[PDB]
Amino acid sequence: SGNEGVIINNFYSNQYQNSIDLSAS
Amino acid sequence: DRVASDKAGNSATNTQSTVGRLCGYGEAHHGEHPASCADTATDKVLAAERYYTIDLASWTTTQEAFSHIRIPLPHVLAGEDGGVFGATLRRHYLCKTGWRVQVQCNASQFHAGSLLVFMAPEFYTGKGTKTGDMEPTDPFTMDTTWRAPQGAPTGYRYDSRTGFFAMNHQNQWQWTVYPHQILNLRTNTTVDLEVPYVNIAPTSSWTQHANWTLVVAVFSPLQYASGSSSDVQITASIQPVNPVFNGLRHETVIA
């Protein structure tokens, strides 16, 4: 969706690379 | 169900106001032999596995919040009062054990006050600074007089200077994090505790380390109206749980 176009795009785990989305309810 | 009895060899404690037995770290000394020693251990000595009942202290209206007494282990039972247990302990390099304790103290429905009775690993038992060496005094001896709290619990330095703090610091405001029970004059005359074996090593060079300490501390000051029985003692029944001995030798002269 955003301005990111790299295939090997993992290296750092997802949960580290980004804030964790979680729904209150 | 507030009435209970506990037997150990030829000894037996008994109470009519118990509030249960608090078992530290949720587990007990099973008497396993130490993987660090090659020699078959000496263990299961009935004569040594009982309650040794002794005097702790005299509680008075004078003592204030957090005043306390420290009882070191096994040390306090390493000599005469330790009977066969102390006698066997004195002849071995290494000992590994747990503790089962009952602290006793009664008053009346017209008396007020409360005690914090607990057990802590690696708790400072030093009495004072030895003039000359820059080390403590009588680490392994039980307090014979109530100990005043530190307004700022920063511990004790031996370099005769002050500032910052020492590694032997003990912050009483948090003492309830240790395995414990509260002895409240209006509720109960006894507390029952138990702890496993813990330490920096598989078994212990007891001769030079008091790995566990039994601490009795005042929470709310003793109080009573004139005419009410003024004399109040605190005693205790201490029992070695599954003591295991290694490295038999000529006797260490505690004496």
Partner: protein, 230 residues
């Protein structure tokens, strides 16, 4: 053949919190076995639930693990804790000691009260929690309008009072860093006077401890403003 690489602008940079490991220089080293050990734990959060003592200030301004009550109904409150980890009467509780190493919290705080007066003594207290918006309560009557519970003395010595987590935001800052100062107050009042017979100490002491409740959590590990023990 060599692999061509694009060297990122941030090179040679060191990260105190880098999510990765570094080079091993003494491999195949066995870690001295410690299977005998007991008392082990994994979550700092647990330490938080162990009730520890609140530091109550005296006129000459020195602290006690408790507060006192007697055969009277003090027009004002007996003690009042400000639901706020940063808050000072907690300065020295395990709860606060852990909390100051984290940026935010969520959930219930549990206030534990223990009556140490004589068995022959009786009476009732009114413990309350007041959320912000209308200012802190100045009378039992007002307090009684917020969240409250009546504590009756008797056979059972103690009482666990829960300060509910009522808030606009899913989380709350753990520290008084700038000034919205608080998240409401916990106030303790006499409902009825401590009553008793002749021959009984007229002034009873109530131990006051605090701890994190069940719901409770902390997050974002940080450093507190450095300090020096007295």
């Amino acid at each position: 053949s060599p692999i061509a690489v694009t060297v990122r602008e941030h090179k040679g940079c060191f990260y105190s919190t880098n999510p990765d490991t570094t080079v091993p220089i003494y491999g195949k080293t066995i870690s001295t076995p410690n299977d005998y050990m007991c008392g082990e734990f994994s979550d700092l959060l647990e330490l938080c639930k162990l009730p520890t003592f609140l530091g109550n200030p005296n006129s000459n301004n020195k602290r006690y693990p408790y507060f006192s009550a007697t055969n009277s109904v003090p027009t004002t409150s007996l003690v009042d804790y400000q639901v706020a980890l940063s808050c000072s009467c907690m300065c020295n509780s395990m709860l606060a000691a852990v909390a100051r190493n984290f940026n935010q919290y969520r959930g219930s705080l549990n206030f534990l009260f223990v009556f140490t007066g004589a068995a022959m003594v009786k009476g009732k207290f009114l413990i309350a929690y007041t959320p912000p918006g209308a200012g802190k309560p100045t009378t039992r009557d007002q307090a009684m309008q917020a969240t409250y519970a009546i504590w009756d003395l008797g056979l059972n010595s103690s009482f666990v009072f829960t300060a509910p987590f009522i808030s606009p935001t899913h989380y709350r800052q753990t520290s008084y860093t700038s000034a919205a100062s608080v998240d409401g107050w916990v106030t303790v009042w006499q409902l009825t006077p401590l009553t008793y017979p002749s021959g009984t100490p007229v002034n009873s002491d109530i131990l006051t401890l605090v701890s994190a409740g069940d719901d409770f959590t902390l997050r974002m590990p940080i450093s507190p403003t450095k300090w020096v023990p007295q």
